[PDB]
Design a protein around this motif. Structure first.
Motif, PDB file in Angstrom:
ATOM      1  N   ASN A 183       0.831  -1.193   0.000  1.00 47.08           N
ATOM      2  CA  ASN A 183       0.000   0.000   0.000  1.00 47.08           C
ATOM      3  C   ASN A 183       0.875   1.255   0.000  1.00 47.08           C
ATOM      4  N   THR A 234      -2.539   3.113  -0.242  1.00 49.49           N
ATOM      5  CA  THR A 234      -3.788   2.433  -0.512  1.00 49.49           C
ATOM      6  C   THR A 234      -4.361   2.145   0.855  1.00 49.49           C
ATOM      7  N   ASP A 249      -9.314  -1.145  -0.539  1.00 49.52           N
ATOM      8  CA  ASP A 249      -8.703  -2.070  -1.492  1.00 49.52           C
ATOM      9  C   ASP A 249      -9.763  -3.094  -1.889  1.00 49.52           C
ATOM     10  N   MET A 277      -2.522  -2.012  -5.159  1.00 49.40           N
ATOM     11  CA  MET A 277      -3.699  -2.674  -4.615  1.00 49.40           C
ATOM     12  C   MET A 277      -3.247  -4.121  -4.549  1.00 49.40           C
ATOM     13  N   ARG A 330      -0.472   2.022 -11.854  1.00 52.02           N
ATOM     14  CA  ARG A 330      -0.122   1.791 -10.456  1.00 52.02           C
ATOM     15  C   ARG A 330       1.172   0.984 -10.382  1.00 52.02           C
TER      16      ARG A 330
END
Ligand SMILES: CCCCCCCCCCCCCCCCCC(=O)OC[C@H](COP(=O)([O-])OCC(O)COP(=O)([O-])OC[C@@H](COC(=O)CCCCCCCCCCCCCCCCC)OC(=O)CCCCCCCCCCCCCCCCC)OC(=O)CCCCCCCCCCCCCCCCC
Ligand code: HEM
Ligand code: HEM
Ligand SMILES: C/C=C(C)/C=C/C=C/[C@H](OC)[C@@H](C)[C@@H](OC)[C@@H](C)CCc1oc2c(O)c(OC)cc(OC)c2c(=O)c1C
Ligand SMILES: COC1=C(OC)C(=O)C(CC=C(C)C)=C(C)C1=O
Lengths: 99, 89, 85, 73, 365, 42
Positions: free
Chosen positions: A16, A70, A75, A21, A50
């Protein structure tokens, strides 16, 4: 509460902190590759960015500002419906191959 | 207001050129100039006189990746001399 | 040089291109440079001059690069920079 | 595996500067130390304990060995 | 080109990825110093030890080439162990072909270094040749026959030394060919990276980024090697090998080269011949099982806390076994070694696969 | 020739302003060159 160690674990795992994710971190085998191929444009492009952002932070041995990490509660598994079906399809084929 | 401020500071007689090419004589062109552009401002004042500072060139790169487009476009350049330099030839 | 001579004269064909050359030239050079002058400037260029002027602007100089589209294969800037020498 | 055939990427822009236009050691100490400290702290609980255990087993076993070689341990 | 210059590489591989090139350099270094030593070395038992002292005392710079070769072998193992550790931690073993060839490479380098150590024919040379070849005697029915066949006689002697020079001479070149195959399989996939996540969206060219980083790494390797050669050439060696081989007497505190100590501790912990040999073989061959024991949904240990803790426990355990291998077979070392030996196999076969499953559960997949 | 064509070929409109002038008004003409991009007028 299991759930208590879960949020603890999530933060200890630390993907995170790179803005990833959970599904961005799965080991890619053939089932996963097929599932990624089946993703709609937006989910695919978001995943790519990401991962790219995470690889960049890793290269600089850096992490994101905490506010950008995150969040555990937010998530969600975007890959699950796709991977689950890919696996189901392969299992069906494997059953047929044994008959 | 932005547009008038801009035009006010930039559209001044000393920064303009009335040009013509073809079947005409310079004398007639000039007389028409005097006739129609005489009232054109030749002075914003001294607090305005918009003057250009040099612009720094930076060796750098900008890549906009878009695999959805069929062909790639690439432009590369080094810093050139500027209009009036003899080297341009 | 021959390509340049032809481009210069063929461009100044018609009232519009000539009118524009007049207007822009007065702003840029402060005067209209006549074809005979361009000819003199062109005539004096030879292989030596081309090598020296190109070396001056291209040789071991940092370039600016822009890419758009399927550019996964566009060389890395360092590789592009080393290609300048 | 060759550039041009790795994977599909869309809508990502990357800005870079020539190495001749920038410093090779920007905020080396001012930002480097904090980062080293952070990285060191983030891992210590995972790396150090087993080695501390080794140390304890090492000192304990060595002492126990010497003690056993004498008249009055 | 395309095998080097424009080879795509992850933008984020760390210094742990420098050991592959460092192993290549250790191999070249061993080959170069090795050939030059072979130009003055003679394999007859009457003159082997003598020829080595002749190299160190009278051949111009013979001493530096010799100690560079001896310490180079140590650097080779430091790098090998770092290289394998990187692989386990980051899940690089999922590149099955590359990994298994790597296991073959480890065994071949071990066999190669073993035979080289026998060449100077000092005390450790002789007893090492005796013990290690005798591992084969654990093979039922034909084991003893295999040993005598390898020895060329009923005991380690001339025939042994001469063939060992030949084997030690050629094996490194075979290692080089096997390493090239190692790299070819790797190139089919490209490198893994600290995150264990595909890096196809962010590849950079190997040159100039990793060529310069590898050179920096090479410089650090040379510094470490030369600190040993110029300031402490005997630090990692054994004084007993400065004594010519004596077939009638095994030194009382005989111990293996440091890079073999962990395996020696494992074998010594089992009071049974066949059992000890099987544990020794398995302590290395278990590397081939790692891929089958991978339970995590994630490739690398970077995002796996529990797995990391067990990984460092394994490293600390190998450190324990290394220490125990250097101690006499007395209390309480006998028991510490047995626990450490059991812990080694337990971490790899049971605890790590289990931590992998628990971590999956905690992430809900 | 020396002059590059107005538009180099390879192998948007969203407003009425950018659309004005798009309607054809004369017969077609096709050009091919040694040194210049091909063109098709009208
Ligand atoms: C015994 C074993 C001997 C075996 C032989 C030796 C093997 C050596 C392995 C290779 C390591 C060298 C290498 O190529 O890695 C470059 C490695 C990466 O450091 P870097 O180039 O500064 O990268 C910045 C980080 O990615 C960004 O991280 P940062 O911002 O936190 O900065 C880290 C950096 C600067 O931080 C500070 O210390 C300040 O600290 C250093 O590494 C120095 O540098 C070194 O470890 C060697 C520097 C020595 C001069
Ligand atoms: C003579 C010995 C060896 C040489 C010269 C060698 C060389 C290399 C080279 C040049 C690389 C690429 C750079 C790197 O990622 O480190 C590499 C990668 C790798 N090697 Fe080795 N190797 C040797 C032994 C081994 C051993 C003993 C293992 C493990 C049992 C092994 C497993 C691997 C794996 C799995 C990779 C992929 C690493 C990754 O991409 O994360 N290698 N090796
Ligand atoms: C994988 C590469 C290699 C390794 C790991 C290695 C390792 C060793 C070791 C551990 C010794 C004992 C050193 C001592 O304490 O004296 C030795 C000796 C020796 N090696 Fe190698 N070696 C390698 C390659 C080679 C090659 C290619 C040659 C020759 C063509 C060679 C020639 C020699 C000679 C002649 C000696 C005896 C003199 C001496 O002891 O220094 N080695 N080697
Ligand atoms: C013709 C070629 C032949 C026969 C090659 C055989 C190769 C065998 C293995 O390599 C693959 C082997 C080297 C490797 O086992 C996996 C090592 C970790 C074994 C380590 C090892 O070392 C010792 C050593 O060095 C000594 O020195 C003075 C003394 C020793 O006890 C007294 C030992 C010892 O008790 C062990 C287990
Ligand atoms: C892609 O992996 C590789 C390396 O890792 C950085 C190397 O150092 C070297 C040297 C080679 C040849 C290689 O293939």
């Amino acid at each position: 509460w299991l759930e208590g160690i879960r949020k603890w674990y999530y933060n200890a795992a630390g993907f995170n902190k790179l803005g990833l994710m959970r599904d961005d971190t799965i080991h890619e085998n053939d089932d996963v590759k097929e599932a990624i191929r089946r993703l709609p444009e937006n989910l695919y492009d978001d995943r790519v960015f990401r991962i790219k952002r995470a690889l960049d932070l890793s290269m600089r041995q850096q992490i994101l500002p905490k506010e950008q990490w995150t969040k555990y509660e937010e998530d969600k598994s975007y890959l699950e419906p796709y991977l689950k079906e890919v696996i189901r399809e392969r299992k069906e084929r494997e059953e047929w191959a044994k008959k | 207001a932005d547009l008038t401020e801009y035009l006010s500071r930039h559209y001044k007689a000393p920064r303009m050129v009335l040009a013509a090419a073809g079947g005409l004589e310079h004398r007639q062109l000039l007389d028409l100039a005097q006739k129609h552009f005489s009232g054109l401002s030749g002075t914003y004042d001294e607090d305005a006189v918009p003057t250009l500072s040099p612009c720094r060139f930076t060796g750098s790169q900008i890549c906009h990746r878009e695999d959805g487009l069929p062909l790639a476009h690439v432009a590369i350049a080094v810093e050139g001399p500027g209009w009036a330099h003899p080297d341009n030839v | 040089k021959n390509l340049l001579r032809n481009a210069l004269v063929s461009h100044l064909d018609g009232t519009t291109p000539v009118c524009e050359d007049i207007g822009r030239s007065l702003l840029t050079y402060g005067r209209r440079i006549p074809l005979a002058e361009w000819e003199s400037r062109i005539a004096e260029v030879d292989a030596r001059v081309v090598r020296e002027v190109c070396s001056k602007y291209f040789y071991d100089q940092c370039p600016a690069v822009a890419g758009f589209g399927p550019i996964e294969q566009l060389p890395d800037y360092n590789r592009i920079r080393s290609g300048m020498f | 595996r060759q550039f041009g055939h790795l994977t599909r990427v869309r809508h990502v822009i990357t800005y870079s500067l020539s190495p001749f236009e920038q410093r090779a050691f920007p905020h080396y100490f001012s930002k480097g130390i904090p980062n080293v400290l952070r990285r060191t702290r983030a891992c210590i609980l995972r790396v150090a304990p087993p080695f501390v255990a080794f140390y304890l087993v090492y000192t304990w076993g060595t002492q126990e060995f010497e003690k056993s070689k004498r008249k009055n341990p | 080109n395309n095998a080097f210059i424009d080879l795509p590489a992850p933008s984020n591989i760390s210094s742990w990825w420098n050991f592959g090139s460092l192993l290549g350099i250790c191999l070249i270094l061993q080959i170069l110093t090795g050939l030059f030593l072979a130009m003055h070395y003679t394999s007859d038992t009457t003159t082997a030890f003598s020829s080595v002292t002749h190299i160190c005392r009278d051949v111009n710079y013979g001493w530096i080439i010799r100690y560079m070769h001896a310490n180079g072998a140590s650097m080779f193992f430091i790098c090998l162990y770092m290289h394998v550790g990187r692989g386990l931690y980051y899940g690089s073993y999922t590149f099955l072909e590359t990994w298994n060839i790597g296991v073959i490479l480890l065994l071949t380098v071990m066999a190669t270094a073993f035979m080289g150590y026998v060449l100077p024919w000092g005390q450790m040379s002789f007893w090492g040749a005796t013990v290690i070849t005798n591992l084969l005697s654990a093979i039922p029915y034909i084991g003893t026959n295999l040993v005598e066949w390898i020895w060329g006689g009923f005991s380690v002697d001339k025939a042994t030394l001469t063939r060992f020079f030949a084997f030690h001479f050629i094996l490194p070149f075979i290692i080089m060919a096997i390493a090239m195959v190692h790299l070819l399989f790797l190139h089919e996939t490209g490198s893994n990276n600290p995150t264990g996540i595909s890096s196809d969206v962010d590849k950079i060219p190997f040159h100039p980024y990793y060529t310069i980083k590898d050179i920096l790494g090479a410089l650090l390797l040379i510094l470490a090697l030369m600190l040993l050669v110029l300031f402490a050439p005997d630090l990692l060696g054994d004084p007993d090998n400065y004594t010519p081989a004596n077939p009638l007497n095994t030194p009382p505190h005989i111990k293996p080269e440091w890079y073999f100590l962990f395996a020696y501790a494992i074998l010594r912990s089992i009071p049974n011949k066949l059992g000890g040999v099987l544990a020794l073989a398995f302590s290395i061959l278990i590397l081939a099982l790692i891929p089958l024991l991978h339970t995590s949904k994630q490739r690398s240990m970077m995002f796996r806390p529990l797995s990391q803790c067990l990984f460092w426990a394994l490293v600390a355990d190998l450190l324990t076994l290394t220490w125990i291998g250097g101690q006499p077979v007395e209390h309480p070392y006998i028991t510490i070694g047995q626990l450490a030996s059991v812990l080694y196999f337990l971490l790899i076969l049971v605890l790590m696969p289990t931590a992998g499953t628990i971590e999956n559960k905690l992430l809900k997949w | 020739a020396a002059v590059p064509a107005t538009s180099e070929s390879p192998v948007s409109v969203l407003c009425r302003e950018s659309l004005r002038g798009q309607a054809a008004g004369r017969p077609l003409v096709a050009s091919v060159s040694l040194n210049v991009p091909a063109s098709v007028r009208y």
